[PDB]
Amino acid sequence: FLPSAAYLTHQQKVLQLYKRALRHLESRCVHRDKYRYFACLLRARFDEHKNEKDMVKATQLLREAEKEFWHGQHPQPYIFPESPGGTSYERYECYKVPEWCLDDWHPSEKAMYPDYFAKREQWKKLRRESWEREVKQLQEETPVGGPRTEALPPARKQGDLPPLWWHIVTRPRERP
Amino acid sequence: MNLFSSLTLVTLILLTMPIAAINFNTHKFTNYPLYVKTTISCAFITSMIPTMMFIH
Amino acid sequence: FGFSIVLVLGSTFVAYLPDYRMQEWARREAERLVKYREAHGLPLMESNCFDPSKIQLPED
Amino acid sequence: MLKYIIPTMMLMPLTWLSKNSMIWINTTLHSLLISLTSLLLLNQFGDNSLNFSLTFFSDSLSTPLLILTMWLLPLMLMASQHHLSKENLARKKLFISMLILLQLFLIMTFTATELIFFYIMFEATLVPTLIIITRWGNQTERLNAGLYFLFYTLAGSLPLLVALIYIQNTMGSLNFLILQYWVQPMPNSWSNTFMWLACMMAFMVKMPLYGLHLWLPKAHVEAPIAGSMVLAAILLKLGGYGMMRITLLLNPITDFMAYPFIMLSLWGMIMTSSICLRQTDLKSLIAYSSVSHMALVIVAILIQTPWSYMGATALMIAHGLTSSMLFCLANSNYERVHSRTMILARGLQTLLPLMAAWWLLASLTNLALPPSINLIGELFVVMSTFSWSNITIILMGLNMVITALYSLYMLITTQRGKHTHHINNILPSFTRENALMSLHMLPLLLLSLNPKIILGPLY
Amino acid sequence: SHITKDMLPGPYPKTPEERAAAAKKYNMRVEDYEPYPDDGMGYGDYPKLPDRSQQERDPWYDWDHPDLRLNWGEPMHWDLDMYIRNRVDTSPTPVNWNLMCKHLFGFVAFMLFMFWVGETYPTYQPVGPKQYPYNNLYLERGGDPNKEPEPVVHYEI
Amino acid sequence: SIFAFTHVLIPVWIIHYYLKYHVTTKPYTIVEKKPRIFPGDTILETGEVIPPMKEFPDQ
Amino acid sequence: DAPPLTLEGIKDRVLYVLKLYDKIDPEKLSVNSHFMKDLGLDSLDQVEIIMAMEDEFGFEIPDIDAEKLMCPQEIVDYIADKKDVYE
Amino acid sequence: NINENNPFLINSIKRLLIGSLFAGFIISNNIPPMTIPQMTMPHYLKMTALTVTIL
Amino acid sequence: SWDKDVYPEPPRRTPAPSPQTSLPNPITYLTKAFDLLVDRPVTLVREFIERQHAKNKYYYYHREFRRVPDITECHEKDVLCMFEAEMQWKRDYKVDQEIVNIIQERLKACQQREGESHRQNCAKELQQFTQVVKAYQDRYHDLGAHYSARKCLAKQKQRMLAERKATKEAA
Amino acid sequence: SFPKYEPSRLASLPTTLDPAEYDISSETRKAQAERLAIRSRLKREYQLQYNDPSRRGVVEDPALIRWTCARSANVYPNFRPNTKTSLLGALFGIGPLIFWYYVFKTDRDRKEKLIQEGKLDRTFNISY
Amino acid sequence: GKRLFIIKPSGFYDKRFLKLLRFYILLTGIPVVIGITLINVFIGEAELAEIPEGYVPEHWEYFKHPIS
Amino acid sequence: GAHLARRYLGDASVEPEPLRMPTFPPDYGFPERKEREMVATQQEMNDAQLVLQQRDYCAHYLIRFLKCKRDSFPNFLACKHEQHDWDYCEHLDYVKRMKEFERERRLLQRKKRREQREA
């Protein structure tokens, strides 16, 4: 379940197991230096059989490593208070007003803010300027009838901005 | 005593003015936290007296 | 014509009006009746509100 | 009363010979003048009812419902544009005149001396709302909605006619005093049980009870705002007032024969509070909310305590106000986005910054916030039913818990948490919708200040 | 707008035609489409999904509806309203479920049984009765100003 | 200063008006729970003592 | 509550806490240095590096990114995505 | 960013530590005793509270 | 004002306190300053308003009704006797409810005055409250919502029939 | 070591011990790749109907409308009255109703017989 | 040069409706409250007398407040 | 204490049943052992509005302590001698209750084991 491929790989699965074991062992072990010792022990236990040519042995010991880690997890891991699930989960979402608003103001308030709204007018002209032709040409140009991926190529041809840019450029500052 | 009931009811009614005040405000008075703080402090310093009469 | 002449005028209209369900009339009537029956020695609220002499019971 | 009737007749050609861009102001202005005129009604006192000569009278039960109706009319008459403000001049005048004629039969129905006059004006109240919701229902099943509507209400309301002609031709005329002052207790035959079943079942159809409750929700979600608010508020509380009239007769048999209707009402109150916890189609949740509160009303009517009647009329008027408001809010949200569903258009705390206060105040008067009239009604109904039986209070509080649950779920579902940022069309709030909000919630809180008015004849 | 054949009356039969039509209409793989089936419970022919889907779908994929877990084209499983976060946490529990309920019910039973053993067995220090002098404080109970004189006295010990 | 002036003079005056004359209209209204008197005390109103508490012994 | 973060200062902080790590030199190390090719350290130690950056700045990175950073400049670019490092 | 150059913080924390030092004794002195205080406890019963907290 | 003959308020009991302190007495100077700041201007404004009131005079009169003869002398259907009788009975019902309310207020006042000794000097007022509420529970309770006057009469007849049967079986 | 995580209808099955991810076939790879292709085409059509500056109104998702039309008006057609649905309806619809009606009969019989005996606490029981 | 630009939704229509509502309840709320104050401070409420022998009042002259 | 262990392990006889303590006839081996002074002024005990379960022995110390606490309100800590005297009187009342408990306990023990083991 990823935008680039269909599956990750075996190596990514061992890799994420390393990262999650390291994080849950942070949450398990206080004082940070006995933690550093045990993290080096975990690095050595992964250095036991890095040199396997077999594949069914690799995925079998990976499955057993998943079993051992699920036996040795922690109920409240130290999820960071920026990530969803933690203490943020968009903590300051009160002021994440998107920019399709702020144009529905009375022209008295628009007279209070002349320069910012004139620059917003030139940004809106930049959106409208080469919206239709170049973006429809690049999006009808490059793929086969099966899209088969969720990325998009940049505007490498001649000129203007890479396509489908507006709602990724225009976004809240994540600390409003 | 008239003082006892009078001061208890004004401790109740000091907790009435800021709500109606910024219901009828229409001008964004930026010292409204200071306003709420000083009226709660005044409500406490009026509330200590009838308790003192009560224990007296 | 929907708030400034309706709402506050209706508030002053329903705030006071005659004694609805004869309420304070019943208050002052009960005060005079309790003082009356305390003065005349009989207990207040004589039970059997209808006259027990004014009955014609079906005999058996 | 005829001085409170004939300016509604004279209000009908106002709309016709008012020219273009002029009908709106004249209709709203003069219906508010009628609201003052009906606010001048309240004179009733002490011993008797107030007679408005021979054709008419008013108990102190019909009076608050009548003043509620004529106050609710200008609210609706301003509510009912922006989906027909671009239609034709003649059809617009026809719509507004049909609303006025509908109000006229509402006042005719509330002010009745004879139950035959009451029944004629009852189905006269029925007939225009049919046309209004069928013509402007704005969804593909409004045909089925109006069809189920008229067929359920006539097919239930029909043996009431035979029973009332029977009471006419066996016990004199049908003044409410002369239906009173003369009624002998009719004992437990089976014919008495059938006649009681006819009258009470006709009004059971009109409430609705639980066995006949699918009458309602199509006729709300596939109906415009005017017919919806008239339907819910005035028609359901009109059926309630009709049973409050006719229940004076047949007292020694309703004890033995009124157990199963209490039962179906209680279990349907529970299951209806459960059914409107999970649904989409936001408009329908208020409809099943109304079904739950009217099942509570029916429990309150069929037990026969003065406490129960006071709680009954308080719950009637307060729920009429609350449901009419919350329908107007759902109309505002549908005029913002043309979806009618629930999970789609979330957010709306950032945008529409004071509309959230009205959603909050409507959901808390639906929550029975305790100084409001709604908790007064629900509370005295709970008191009277615990006097009726010692074990029914679990069902009442279970209704209370689940009612709070679905009302506050409605509050924190559609208007809490995240704009979906593909909506990008809604404009901030008009002064008209906020004006309708201030038309809603000022009379409710003013009645919460002075509630000695709306309590019933057994005050 | 909306096609008449983008409603969905009728069940699953037959296996070529309606399965191919559901693949074309529900935007899904052919074998991933499975009706419930129709045991007479209505349901149209609405698909079966992996049923948990909300404490799943880890939020770093960054799809289009973060608090709704949409993707604008997902078939939206029949019990969606019972599934969104604020309703039901369909997480993998870190221990078990039956082992959890056995621990909890054993604990509640043990504490209530120790409460019952307490309720049959009171505690008391070496302490006599409080000596209320005036006939167990007569004349200030709920009546009897002159009715029952009940003589009972304490002795100095 | 004017804040303290209005909020310790104006509601005090309004409520102290409200707690003399409308309370002396309505009879069964604000009522006390009685001041406790002792054997070693007197009565301020007419003027007489309650006789003092009796003998102590076995301290 | 937010101290003024600039690009070049937070770049110096990232390269500083890389320099404090032992088995790579401060000598042949710059902004356009790689994590697989010229230094030759493995993917496992690369994820130890990513964990050091996460534990300093206080937010994780998603595993859609976890393979494809490989140089400090693109690390600075992703942290500038996260914090919007400007005036 | 550990900063407490703040009159608000020191006033509030200051006044509630003043409260948590004096107000318990101020409450516990001047109340009318509406109950019978026990006041006659054995050995190893008054001591066991502080004993359990220290252990 | 009102009548103390109908609203019993027991006479005042106030001691004179005795310090035995020399700090002294903050609340005494506080209530003297409160009297000097509040008790005089409220009196001045009330005297102004009392002159402005009593310059002219109004009157409210206690509305009094006469006595309808009977419902027992009314006929079978024959309405215009029954209407007088039932409205007179309904006014008696309202004034009897207010009797119950006033006696309950007396019970609340006896509770609040007498201190924590609840059962001192309230047994007679509790006794008369139980007497009047025994009469009320016997007379007006178990009829429901549609009282007109006739259900009270039916209850009265059935209750004295039960009393007749009880004393005849007791004899 | 661990009891291998029994599942339930509440305890969700995590991504680690599937174990059927590890039985890699060409069938499962083709299924996952075509699933990615379906979500790719849907996100591409969404972003083409999402980013235009002239498009005023809502996105008008047909999947949500499909779910609502399946959930609201596609209940009653289709349906056949079977033995299972009839037994479940009569078990959930008249069962608890006759249960509460029996217990109201019981409580009302007790109250009627007790107050006919007159041994009730109605020294003052006014507010009925 | 330190501050950022925040994106408020709208304030104009909100303060317009609330300014109009406070002014249009204030326009005949304050004169009516002043008027009822002037009535019950100038004209007198009522006095406590009773009906003399053989003298009839009307259906008014029975009430406390004079506007009632 | 260990009396609780004796009541939960040994016989139920010699441990007396709680709050049904008057068991044996009073003035058993006493004769003429009673005065019961009770000089706590019942009408003045009404006049000072005490609490129920306080209208008992040692009340006059409570009367004098409440009197001095009423009299000395700015003296926040002066009234402690009468407070300690009331503590002392209720301490001696607890002594009397303990002596009455072991009176009934030892009469039960010695007399009932005497009769039931020398019958």
PDB file of C-alpha atoms in Angstrom, chain C residues 19 21-35 37-38 43-52 54-60, chain I residues 5-7 60 62-64 70-72 89 91 94-96 98-99 101-103 105-106 131-132 135-136 139-140 152-153 156-157 159-160 164:
ATOM      1  CA  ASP C  19     -53.861  37.359  37.580  1.00  0.00           C
ATOM      2  CA  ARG C  21     -55.505  31.372  36.638  1.00  0.00           C
ATOM      3  CA  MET C  22     -56.461  33.777  39.501  1.00  0.00           C
ATOM      4  CA  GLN C  23     -53.113  33.082  41.113  1.00  0.00           C
ATOM      5  CA  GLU C  24     -52.340  35.966  43.467  1.00  0.00           C
ATOM      6  CA  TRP C  25     -56.082  36.320  43.987  1.00  0.00           C
ATOM      7  CA  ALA C  26     -55.924  32.776  45.375  1.00  0.00           C
ATOM      8  CA  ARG C  27     -52.885  33.785  47.460  1.00  0.00           C
ATOM      9  CA  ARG C  28     -54.645  36.681  49.181  1.00  0.00           C
ATOM     10  CA  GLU C  29     -57.901  34.704  49.411  1.00  0.00           C
ATOM     11  CA  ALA C  30     -56.074  31.854  51.150  1.00  0.00           C
ATOM     12  CA  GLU C  31     -54.376  34.281  53.547  1.00  0.00           C
ATOM     13  CA  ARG C  32     -57.721  35.804  54.542  1.00  0.00           C
ATOM     14  CA  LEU C  33     -59.362  32.368  54.794  1.00  0.00           C
ATOM     15  CA  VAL C  34     -56.611  30.896  56.991  1.00  0.00           C
ATOM     16  CA  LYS C  35     -56.755  33.928  59.303  1.00  0.00           C
ATOM     17  CA  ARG C  37     -60.569  29.956  60.284  1.00  0.00           C
ATOM     18  CA  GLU C  38     -57.822  30.459  62.870  1.00  0.00           C
ATOM     19  CA  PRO C  43     -59.374  23.724  62.045  1.00  0.00           C
ATOM     20  CA  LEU C  44     -58.278  24.985  58.642  1.00  0.00           C
ATOM     21  CA  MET C  45     -59.476  22.896  55.679  1.00  0.00           C
ATOM     22  CA  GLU C  46     -62.604  21.326  57.036  1.00  0.00           C
ATOM     23  CA  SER C  47     -62.616  17.935  55.337  1.00  0.00           C
ATOM     24  CA  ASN C  48     -65.682  16.556  53.504  1.00  0.00           C
ATOM     25  CA  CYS C  49     -66.006  19.615  51.250  1.00  0.00           C
ATOM     26  CA  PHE C  50     -69.573  18.638  50.424  1.00  0.00           C
ATOM     27  CA  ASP C  51     -72.013  18.731  53.325  1.00  0.00           C
ATOM     28  CA  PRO C  52     -72.328  15.273  54.966  1.00  0.00           C
ATOM     29  CA  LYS C  54     -76.557  16.855  52.323  1.00  0.00           C
ATOM     30  CA  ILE C  55     -76.394  13.243  51.197  1.00  0.00           C
ATOM     31  CA  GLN C  56     -79.031  10.636  50.334  1.00  0.00           C
ATOM     32  CA  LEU C  57     -77.118   7.367  50.472  1.00  0.00           C
ATOM     33  CA  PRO C  58     -78.415   4.299  48.620  1.00  0.00           C
ATOM     34  CA  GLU C  59     -79.336   2.018  51.507  1.00  0.00           C
ATOM     35  CA  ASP C  60     -78.640  -1.709  51.528  1.00  0.00           C
TER      36      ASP C  60
ATOM     37  CA  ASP I   5     -51.427  36.602  63.083  1.00  0.00           C
ATOM     38  CA  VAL I   6     -51.577  34.441  59.941  1.00  0.00           C
ATOM     39  CA  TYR I   7     -47.784  34.126  59.472  1.00  0.00           C
ATOM     40  CA  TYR I  60     -56.336  47.635  44.282  1.00  0.00           C
ATOM     41  CA  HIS I  62     -59.452  42.146  46.830  1.00  0.00           C
ATOM     42  CA  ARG I  63     -61.877  40.687  44.287  1.00  0.00           C
ATOM     43  CA  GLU I  64     -64.583  38.848  46.214  1.00  0.00           C
ATOM     44  CA  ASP I  70     -75.304  23.886  45.774  1.00  0.00           C
ATOM     45  CA  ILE I  71     -74.432  21.198  43.326  1.00  0.00           C
ATOM     46  CA  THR I  72     -76.581  18.873  45.478  1.00  0.00           C
ATOM     47  CA  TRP I  89     -66.057  24.417  43.556  1.00  0.00           C
ATOM     48  CA  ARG I  91     -62.272  28.262  43.062  1.00  0.00           C
ATOM     49  CA  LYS I  94     -57.538  26.571  43.943  1.00  0.00           C
ATOM     50  CA  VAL I  95     -57.730  28.234  47.347  1.00  0.00           C
ATOM     51  CA  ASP I  96     -57.299  24.840  49.041  1.00  0.00           C
ATOM     52  CA  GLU I  98     -52.876  27.612  48.267  1.00  0.00           C
ATOM     53  CA  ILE I  99     -53.743  26.600  51.851  1.00  0.00           C
ATOM     54  CA  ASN I 101     -48.721  25.806  49.956  1.00  0.00           C
ATOM     55  CA  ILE I 102     -48.886  28.239  52.893  1.00  0.00           C
ATOM     56  CA  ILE I 103     -48.816  25.439  55.485  1.00  0.00           C
ATOM     57  CA  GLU I 105     -44.085  27.300  53.856  1.00  0.00           C
ATOM     58  CA  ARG I 106     -44.782  27.313  57.601  1.00  0.00           C
ATOM     59  CA  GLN I 131     -53.729  16.850  59.628  1.00  0.00           C
ATOM     60  CA  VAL I 132     -54.430  19.120  56.650  1.00  0.00           C
ATOM     61  CA  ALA I 135     -57.634  15.689  54.753  1.00  0.00           C
ATOM     62  CA  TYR I 136     -56.255  16.598  51.320  1.00  0.00           C
ATOM     63  CA  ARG I 139     -60.490  14.324  49.686  1.00  0.00           C
ATOM     64  CA  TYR I 140     -58.905  15.457  46.406  1.00  0.00           C
ATOM     65  CA  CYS I 152     -65.242  14.470  43.752  1.00  0.00           C
ATOM     66  CA  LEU I 153     -68.893  13.844  44.646  1.00  0.00           C
ATOM     67  CA  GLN I 156     -67.227  11.313  48.549  1.00  0.00           C
ATOM     68  CA  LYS I 157     -70.256   9.020  48.192  1.00  0.00           C
ATOM     69  CA  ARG I 159     -65.910   6.814  50.691  1.00  0.00           C
ATOM     70  CA  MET I 160     -68.761   7.434  53.119  1.00  0.00           C
ATOM     71  CA  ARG I 164     -70.799   3.054  56.683  1.00  0.00           C
TER      72      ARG I 164
END
